[PDB]
C-alpha cells in the first residue's frame, strides 16, 4: 500500500528533490511503525542527495535522520509499553521524511510535556549527537573550557546548553554577528566571528593562555592549524565534520604530540543497535527530563524555520546558504 | 666535589660526545642519590645532543633517561624503606649517564632477583613507556590486535612481551629479516619487513580484513596512510615517535573519521612527578614481579650490546645506524 515521501531520482543539487509515492514499510520483530507528524533537516541529508553519504547496509535509502509522530502499528515481539496512539520521537538511520517509518522500540523516546510535535522533531539527532560527543566521547568535566565550532547549528545550539548544564564553559565560533548574539542567549561564555578574527588567539586570550580542554570540531581541514594552537595540554579534540576539509597538509603530528593531545573521531548513523540503544537510554535518563523542568535550567530546542514537505526543495537551499540558526523542521501532511 | 659524566660542549654530531668531570649533585626533600653502576641509550639522547630535545625545566641537562645502581645517600624527608646500599633502578628526566644521580624515591624500583645491574639498566624507560602506551594510554584488552612499529627497539622489545602478557596479539614491523626473527622468539604473532613489503596489506591479511585494534606508532609521517588503512573500527592509534616524519599530506581526517578512530598522542619525559609516581607504582605491582617469576611467562630485558662510558661516542654511531636489536647499555666506572 502506498505512502508519500521525500525523494530524488538521481544524485545532484537541491533542485532534484520532490515528494513521491513510495512503498509503505511494515514492522518486523521488536519494532513499531510511526505515523510521522514532522521531521528535521540535517547536514547529512545534503551530502546524501549529492551522493557522498550512503545509508548503512539495510537501512532505508530516504532522507530523514529523525522524526516525531504517533504510534501507527506494533511489530511482533514488542514490550507492550508503547501502544497505538502514543506520541513519540526517534533517532533514525533514514526514512524520517515520509508519512510512515519503521523504528526499533528501543530508540523510541517520549515527548517532553509542553512541546509540540514540530518542536520534538528537532531533538533527536542534534541533542543525541551533542550528548554523545560531549559525555561519551569527550568526558566533559565541571570546569572544562569547551570550543564548539559551527555553534549555531543543529548540534551546536544543543551543545552550548548541555555544556552549560554539564557545568563547563562553552566557547563558540560562527560566521555572523546575528548568530553569535543568539549563541550568547543560549548561555555561551564567549562567541567569535571567524570571518572577522582568529579564534585561536581569541580562545587563548579568554582562557588566560591555558587553552581549551575539549574541542567539538565539525569543520576539520581549514581549522586544524588553529584548533591545535588553542588546544590545552592533554586536551581532547573531538572530530565529526569535515565541512571545511578532510585533508591535512602540515605538521599536525608534531604539534598534537607537543600538547599531549587526543584526536577522537566519532560517528552515530554508522553505529550498531546495541550502541544506539545505550545512547538513547543514557540520554533519556540524564538529558530528556530537563526538556520539561520549568525555566531557569530548562533545555530549549532551537527552531529556526518550519517548512512543509512539498517545499523540501526550498528548505535545502536555505541550509546550503548557511542561513539557518538552529534546526529547520519539515512538516509531513497527515 | 667532582664526578665523571657524559657531556657535550656544543650541539652537533656524535663526535661532540666525551666524558668530563662535572659537579656531583645532592639530594633534596624526598629523593636519594644513586651511585650509578649502569645506564642505557635511548633515542631521546640522540636528539638532545643535536639540540632538538631539551630537558624539562629544572631537570639536569646531562644525558641519561634511566639508571641502575646502589642507593649511595638519603636526602631529607625520605619515607625510609630504601636504605644505603640497596640496589635499585630508576626512571629519570636526565643525568643518568654519570657516576651519581639524584632520584625521587617514588620513581625508585627494586632490581629483580637474578638480573645484573647492567641488565636492569635496560628496563625503566623502555618498559615503563611500553606499559604506559599499552595499558594507561591505549587500554589494551585481551584479544586485541596490536601493531608495534620498530618492534625491535628499546620500547618495542618490551611492548611485544607486555602485549603477550596482556593476552593480546602483537604484530611487529622492522627493517631486517634478522630483526624479525628475534621478534618471533619474543612472541610476535607476525613480523613484516617494511623495506620488502606493505605492512598495511599484511596487517589486514593477518586480521582477516578486520584491522588492528591498537597501534603503537613511533614512525609518524611516512606511515600515516598505511596506519589509517589497517586500523579497525573504533581502533586506538597511539602516536609517540615521529622518527619517520611529523608532517601529514593527505585525507587523514576523512579516513580516520570513517574508521571512528582515536589518535592518542603520548609523552613520558615531560610529565610531572605525580603522574610518574602513579605510573611507576602501577608498574611495580602489575609488571615488575614477572621479571623474576620462573621461565615460561618470564619477562626478558633485551640487550644488544654493552659499551663503557668512555666509548659513548662509538655507541651513538651504532644506534644512529639502526643496528641495535634491543637496548644498548652504558657502564660507569665506579
Ligand atoms: N558525528 C555524527 O554522527 C553527526 C551527526 C549529525 C551531525 N554531524 C555533523 O554536525 C555538523 C553540523 O550539522 P547540522 O545538521 O547541525 O548542520 P547545520 O544546521 O546546517 O549547520 C551547519 C553550519 O556550519 C557552518 N559552516 C558551514 N560550512 C562551514 C565552513 N566551511 N567553515 C566554518 N563553518 C561552516 C554554517 O554556519 P556559519 O558558517 O555561518 O557559522 C552552517 O550554518 C555537520 O558537519 C554534520 O556532519 C555529525
Ligand atoms: N613517549 C615517550 O616519552 C617516549 C619514550 C621512549 C621512547 N620514545 C620513542 O620511541 C622511539 C624508539 O625509541 P628507542 O630509543 O627504543 O629507539 P631505538 O632503540 O634506537 O630503535 C629505533 C628503531 O626504529 C627504526 N627506525 C628508525 N627510523 C625509522 C624510520 N624513519 N622509519 C621506520 N623505522 C625507523 C630502526 O629499526 P628498523 O629500521 O630496522 O625497523 C631503529 O632500530 C623513538 O622515536 C622515541 O622518541 C618515546
DSSP A26-82: ---SSEEEEEEEEEE--HHHHHHHHTS-PPPTTS-SSS-SEEEEEEEEEPTT--SSS
Compute the distance between CA of residue B16 and CA of residue B93 in angstroms, rounded to an integer.
21
Is B271 annotated to bind a ligand? Reply is no
Return the closest-CA partner of residue A269 out of A261, A279, A259, A260: A279
Q: Which residues, at least 6 apart from B216, have a Cβ–Cβ distance to it below 8 Å?
A: B133, B134, B138, B146, B147, B148, B149, B155, B159, B238, B240
Cα-based torsion angle of the residue sequence A34, A40, A44, A49 in order, rounded to the nearest 10 degrees: 80
Beta strands in A75-225 (DSSP E): 87-91, 100-104, 108-109, 145-149, 169-174, 190-193, 212-217
Q: Which residues, at least 6 apart from B138, have a Cβ–Cβ distance to it below 8 Å?
A: B214, B216, B236, B238, B264
Q: Give the pairing type, strands B2-8 and B17-23.
A: antiparallel
Q: Is A43 close to ligand 1, i.e. is its CB under 6 Å away?
A: yes
The number of the ligand 2 atom at minimal distance from the alpha carbon of B269 is 3
Instruction: Return the half-sphere exposure (C-beta side, CA atoms, 13 A cut-off) of residue A39.
Output: 32
Tell me, in angstroms, the distance from the centre of ligand 2 to residue B130's CA: 12
DSSP A168: -
Instruction: Count Cβ atoms below 10 Å from residue B321 Cβ, excluding itself.
Output: 8
DSSP H stretches of helix in B116-191:
117-120, 124-131, 154-165, 177-185
Is A268 annotated to bind a ligand? Reply is yes
Report resolution in angstroms: 3.0
CB contact under 8 A, A248 and B245: no
Instruction: Count Cβ atoms below 10 Å from residue A84 Cβ, excluding itself.
Output: 12
* Helix B154-165 × helix B177-185 angle, to 10°: 30
Residues 203-242 of B with CB under 8 A from A: 220-221, 224, 239-240, 242
Compute the distance between CA of residue A259 and CA of residue A270 in angstroms, rounded to an integer.
30
What are A255's three cell numbers?
A: 604539534
Q: Which of B53, B252, B264, B274 to mutate to test the interface with A (most CBs of A within 10 A)?
A: B252
Return the closest-CA partner of residue B87 out of B48, B122, B45, B118: B118
Q: Give the pairing type, strands A31-40 and A100-104.
A: antiparallel
DSSP H stretches of helix in A154-206:
154-165, 177-185, 199-206
Return the closest-CA partner of residue B217 out of B247, B200, B238: B238
Return the closest-CA partner of residue B125 out of B63, B83, B202: B63
CA-based R_g, chain B, Å: 20
The answer to whether A213 and A145 are in contact (CB under 8 A) is yes
Q: Ligand 2 atom 24: the closest Cα is on which residue?
A: B150
Domains and CATH numbers, chain A: 1-122+267-334 (3.90.180.10), 123-266 (3.40.50.720)
Compute the distance between CA of residue A299 and CA of residue B105 in angstroms, rounded to an integer.
51
Compute the distance between CA of residue A270 and CA of residue A251 in angstroms, rounded to an integer.
30
Q: Ligand 2 atom 9: the closest Cα is on which residue?
A: B241
Resolved by: X-ray
Of B246, B253, B266, the CB nearest to A239: B253
Compute the distance between CA of residue B258 and CA of residue B252 in angstroms, rounded to an integer.
10
Would you call B85 exposed, middle or buried from its count of C-beta atoms within 10 A (0-12, 13-18, 19+)?
A: exposed
Ligand 2 pocket by C-beta < 6 Å: which residues?
B 42-44, 125, 129, 150, 153-155, 174-176, 179, 218-219, 222, 240-241, 243-244, 266-269, 319, 322, 324
- Scored b (16 or more CB within 10 A) or e, A242-251 reads bbbbbbbeeb
CB contact under 8 A, A253 and B246: yes
CB contact under 8 A, B263 and A262: yes
What are A183's three cell numbers?
A: 549563541
CA distances from A316 to A63, A307, A320, A332 (A): 12, 10, 6, 16
The answer to whether A240 and A267 are in contact (CB under 8 A) is yes
Instruction: Count Cβ atoms below 10 Å from residue A167 Cβ, excluding itself.
Output: 11
- Three-class SS of residue B16? helix
Residue given cell 520539561 in the structure block: A292
Q: Ligand 2 atom 7: the closest Cα is on which residue?
A: B155
CA distances from A76 to A28, A32, A34, A79, A80 (A): 6, 9, 15, 9, 10
Amino acid at each position: 500500500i502506498p505512502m508519500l515521501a521525500v525523494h530524488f531520482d538521481k544524485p545532484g543539487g537541491p533542485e532534484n528533490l520532490y515528494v513521491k509515492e513510495v512503498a509503505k514499510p511494515s514492522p518486523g520483530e521488536g519494532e513499531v511503525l510511526l505515523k510521522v507528524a514532522a521531521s528535521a533537516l540535517n547536514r547529512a541529508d545534503l551530502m546524501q542527495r549529492q551522493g557522498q553519504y550512503d545509508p548503512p547496509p539495510g537501512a532505508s535509502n530516504i532522507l530523514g535522520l529523525e522524526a516525531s509522530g504517533h504510534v501507527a502499528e506494533l511489530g511482533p515481539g514488542c514490550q507492550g509499553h508503547w501502544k497505538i496512539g502514543d506520541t513519540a520521537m526517534a533517532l533514525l538511520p533514514g526514512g524520517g521524511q515520509a508519512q510512515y517509518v519503521t523504528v526499533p522500540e528501543g530508540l523510541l523516546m517520549p515527548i517532553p510535556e509542553g512541546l509540540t510535535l514540530t518542536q520534538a522533531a528537532a531533538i533527536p539527532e542534534a541533542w543525541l549527537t551533542a550528548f554523545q560527543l560531549l559525555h561519551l566521547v569527550g568526558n566533559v568535566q565541571a570546569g572544562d573550557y569547551v570550543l564548539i565550532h559551527a555553534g549555531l547549528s543543529g548540534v551546536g545550539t544543543a551543545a552550548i546548553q548541555l555544556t552549560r548544564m554539564a557545568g563547563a564553559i562553552p566557547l563558540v565560533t560562527a560566521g555572523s554577528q546575528k548568530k553569535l548574539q543568539m549563541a550568547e542567549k543560549l548561555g555561551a561564555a564567549a562567541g567569535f566571528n571567524y570571518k572577522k578574527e582568529d579564534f585561536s588567539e581569541a580562545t587563548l586570550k579568554f582562557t588566560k593562555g591555558a587553552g581549551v580542554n575539549l574541542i567539538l570540531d565539525c569543520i576539520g581541514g581549514s581549522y586544524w592549524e588553529k584548533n591545535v594552537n588553542c588546544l590545552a595540554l592533554d586536551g581532547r579534540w573531538v572530530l565529526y565534520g569535515l565541512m571545511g576539509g578532510g585533508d591535512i597538509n602540515g605538521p599536525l603530528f608534531s604539534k598534537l604530540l607537543f600538547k599531549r593531545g587526543s584526536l577522537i573521531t566519532s560517528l552515530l548513523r554508522s553505529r550498531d543497535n546495541k550502541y544506539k540503544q545505550m545512547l538513547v537510554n543514557a540520554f533519556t535518563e540524564q538529558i530528556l527530563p530537563h526538556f520539561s523542568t520549568e525555566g531557569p535550567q530548562r533545555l530549549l530546542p532551537v527552531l529556526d524555520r518550519i517548512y512543509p514537505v512539498t517545499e523540501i526543495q526550498e528548505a535545502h537551499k536555505y541550509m546550503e546558504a548557511n542561513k539557518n540558526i538552529g534546526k529547520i523542521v519539515l512538516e509531513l501532511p497527515q
